[model samples]
Target: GSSGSSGVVEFTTCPDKPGIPVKPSVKGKIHSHSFKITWDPPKDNGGATINKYVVEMAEGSNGNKWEMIYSGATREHLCDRLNPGCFYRLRVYCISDGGQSAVSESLLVQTPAVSGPSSG
Candidate 1:
């Protein structure tokens, strides 16, 4: 094969990571302490197939401590025992071959109020 006519040619590799994900939501509570976190795929997949999706969770509107609750090739989680009776926050991220997408917007879910100790 002959080299194509070109004054200058440059090849750049794009890092594998999708753009910011969207549509983060907490599905209706199907069971006690159980809910589902759902989100849409990232706008851009950064030129590679996303390897997995990561869901991080925390209690209240906090960022200090976060737990990686799930990591897989899906975009949703049927979360169970989601630390009942408190406000919980969640974030989603898309993982590509080389990197991870920016974290999605935080989704806040309020646990239903249940019977508690009564003052007598």
Candidate 2:
């Protein structure tokens, strides 16, 4: 057997997508058409740094449909443009260079109805 010159070899592993983040928490002040929701970062980032977080909202009557309301680095969001005395479902998702992670558990909220009435 004859020996030949060996070449250098290198192996790099790409980071995987982040995991599902913690469920959004419904807290803070509440109003007839607005409320606040907060959540924590994902447990597994898969080595890739997170870019931003996404916030979604679903009407309680139509929980199957979700709409993106916010996207940023913050974990807390003040959701508005809602009907008074209506129920809503809120969730959060994390995004990174690898990809977007699974959505967090849904957070339920019900905006308080208006206390005053306008009579003309």
Candidate 3:
């Protein structure tokens, strides 16, 4: 069950690591508990179609650990269940079959402002 004669063998792999997306243009694009952020596509896709993206968020920065707000097979994401009126930083991570790029530029934002009593 063994072949003795062989010339050569070769294997090929994919390198789909794309550049991280730019700082997302966000704010006002939201739902009651969501932030529908948007951004331009990464400059480099590493010659493959992006199949997934990871979005993480955190309170403030410099020390606060980030949390995964959403992950899916798309670029755009609208984080949900977020408390109204808060400050946070968001990052976008690109993914493909090969690998993932570094997290995108950190975006600082403030959630919806509170409403005051109506004038009667």
Candidate 4:
């Protein structure tokens, strides 16, 4: 004879508040003379729906100083105005009534002297 036992699992919910952003990445390609960027939402939305997102981008070695290029209540957007042979950086921020979550990891991209599908 054998006896088996299983332990109970407990689940808890988070407070009604905004969550931190998660899983941020970027990609690039060569085309005519432009760069396109795209990204996905965080893995965990922190139990709260995102109100909006802010995207910041910049050029050159000084890419740390990113300038907000897009701000809206969507998870996706495109950046068409980019130069070739230039360094770029991008960051996304999840916002809600609770407050603005921490910025996602900075993404570094280089735009070829051409246009193509570049995601972030």
Per-candidate clash tally = 0, 0, 0, 11
Which portions of model 4 miss their true places by more than 4 Å? 1-17, 22-33, 114-120
* Tens digit per residue, CA lDDT, model 2, 36-101: 888877675677788989888888757588888998898888898888877888878888765576
- For lDDT, the strongest prediction is 2
Cα lDDT of all candidates, in order? 0.70, 0.77, 0.68, 0.64
Lowest lDDT 10-mer window, candidate 3? 1-10
lDDT of 1 by residue, 1-113 (tens): 32233443574674433576785786665444788878877665566777788888777786566888887877788766565567777788877654665687778777765
Which has the greatest TM-score? 2
Estimate the TM-score for candidate 2: 0.77
Residue 105 of model 1, lDDT score: 72
TM-score of each: 0.73, 0.77, 0.67, 0.65
Query: Model 3: runs farther than 4 Å from truth?
Result: 1-13, 27-33, 115-120
Count backbone clashes in candidate 1.
0
> Which 10 consecutive positions of candidate 2 have the poorest summed lDDT?
1-10
Off by over 4 Å in 2: 1-12, 116-120
In terms of lDDT, the poorest run of 10 residues in model 4 is 1-10
Per-residue lDDT of model 4, residues 1-120, tens digit only: 211222424735534555656534544554333555566776766667788887887675683577878888666667667677677667788877556766777676666554555674
